[PDB]
Structures are given as C-alpha cells and as structure tokens.
Design a binder for these strands. Structure first.
Ligand SMILES: [Mg+2]
Ligand SMILES: [Mg+2]
Ligand SMILES: [Mg+2]
Ligand SMILES: [Mg+2]
Ligand SMILES: [Mg+2]
Ligand SMILES: [Mg+2]
Ligand SMILES: [Zn+2]
Length: 198
RNA sequence: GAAGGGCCAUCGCUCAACGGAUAAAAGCUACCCCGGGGAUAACAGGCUUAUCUCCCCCAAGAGUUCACAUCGACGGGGAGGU
C-alpha cells in the first residue's frame, strides 16, 4: 500500500524517464535516469514484487511505450489506497456550521490519486476541504473560493496553473479542482504546509 | 330624623388573550374513553418539480502542438417523474 502523493511522484519520475528517452540522445545520461527511476521505485517499495520488477524492466528499456507506461501505472495504482470519504453524519460533525453540506461523488481512481478531498459550493462561492492529519483524525476546512480563475503558482500543489483565490486578510490562489491539485501534488507534507500557512 | 339609595363629578383594571367568560385556576395519559373529520396530519395515489437523476448549448481551457480521442471552467437550455 502506498500514499496517493507517492503514486503521483512515481508517475512523475516515469514521465521524466519517458521524456528522457524522447529528448536525451546519450545512452549514458539515459542510464543515470533509468537507475534514478529504479532507485525511486525501490524507495517507494521496500520489497518489490515480480510485477514491479517487470514494470521496472519495461521502464529500463529505452523503447518505452505510453501503453506500457499506462499498464505500469495501473499496476502501481492497485498498490495505492483511495482517500476515504467521511460518512454524511460524520461530515456533519466535521462541518456543524455548514447546513445541508453536499459532497460531489468522487471517482475511485480520483480518490486513489487524491491525498485530500475538497469541493466548492460555487453558489455560495465557498470551498469545503476534508483531509486526514498525521494523527489521522479527519480535518475539514470551509473557506470562500473566488469564482475567477487565473494561472498562478499554487501553494497546495506547489505548481503553477490556473487557480482560484481562496479566502478563509491574506489571499492565496488555489487550483479550482482539488483532484487536479492532488494530481499536481507530489507530497502530503506540502499540502500540510499549505494548511500550516493558512 | 337616620341608615341606606338616586343624580352629577371623579378614582380603583399589562381585565395587554386589550368587546374584558369567574373575585378566584397548572400539568400527564403508551391504562385510556366517547362524539365527530379525509373540513386535518402519518402510507399510497394526483398535481408540482425547488431538490434529484439523466441529456444537452457555448467552449475558457487540459490533452507535447491540437477545445471537441478523452475531459470540459464560468455560464445557458431541457427531459424524466425512481
Ligand atoms: Mg378580543
Ligand atoms: Mg370572552
Ligand atoms: Mg372514536
Ligand atoms: Mg382533503
Ligand atoms: Mg387510492
Ligand atoms: Mg437533452
Ligand atoms: Zn493546487
């Protein structure tokens, strides 16, 4: 079992390796990336199954294919555990102030790749985000979200993309989609740092 | 004669549930009872469709480039009657 952010990190290194094959014309430079990618996967899993080894083998080969990548990603995805959505009665305890709070249905894959879950009402222009801390107690935050979206560096994912200003007076632009933000996010601590910044 | 009445004048009410039932009044019933009501609720039907489910319009964008492979922000229009 691996964290969502870890999987995103694995995905990124795999994409890098494919990009390296695409761009780099030197095998030796490629080899260093191949080893680094291998090391990164070895960092993720203390013990690697034969399927992971097969995936590594496919990754190691210079002639990587996007279908092969997707298959490797699917195998890695299986290891990942989806984010647990709270019970509505539990959620009501999380958000007592909020009345008739509604969570949009999340795809299982989305939950698997999402370190945290967040949704915006839009009608009230308020975004509600739920996450499990290091203590593993679910923490819900409700804050105003700007309707306007403009490209900007986002603290939550630590990436530059189209973002919506979030208010909860310091103002920070955050990605409109939390799932998109999660996909961009590579470390759960980085999201925690954003929460600490709040 | 007086006592006590009448007439005139005036005083005493958050009688505020303010045309004030008495000077004087709160609750429980799954131990319940009678007379009634579909004039009125709980089930199902009917109407309705906010909500809900589903389908669309525009296409900012994402997708190496490339809106429309796939996905689709902000908005807009419906259908169904679970
Ligand atoms: Mg009266
Ligand atoms: Mg009376
Ligand atoms: Mg009777
Ligand atoms: Mg009737
Ligand atoms: Mg009937
Ligand atoms: Mg339609
Ligand atoms: Zn973000």
């Amino acid at each position: 079992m691996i964290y969502p952010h870890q999987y995103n990190y694995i995905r990124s290194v795999i994409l890098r390796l494919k990009n390296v094959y695409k761009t780099v014309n030197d095998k030796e430079t490629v080899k260093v990336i191949q080893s680094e990618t291998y090391n990164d996967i070895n960092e993720i899993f203390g013990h690697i199954d034969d399927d992971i080894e097969e995936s590594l083998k496919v990754l190691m080969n210079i002639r990587l294919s996007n279908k092969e990548i997707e298959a490797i990603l699917n195998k890695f995805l299986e290891y990942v555990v989806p984010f647990e959505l709270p019970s509505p009665q539990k959620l009501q305890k999380v958000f007592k102030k909020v009345k008739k709070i509604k969570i949009p249905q999340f795809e299982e894959y989305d939950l698997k790749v999402s370190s945290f879950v967040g949704w915006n009402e839009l009608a009230s222009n308020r975004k509600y985000i739920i996450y499990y801390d290091e203590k593993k107690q679910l923490k819900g935050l409700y804050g105003e979200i700007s309707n306007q979206v403009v490209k900007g560096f986002c603290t939550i994912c630590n990436k530059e993309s189209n973002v919506s200003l979030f208010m909860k007076k310091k103002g920070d632009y955050i990605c409109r989609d939390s799932i998109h933000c999660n996909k961009q996010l590579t470390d759960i601590n980085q999201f925690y740092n954003f929460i600490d910044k709040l």
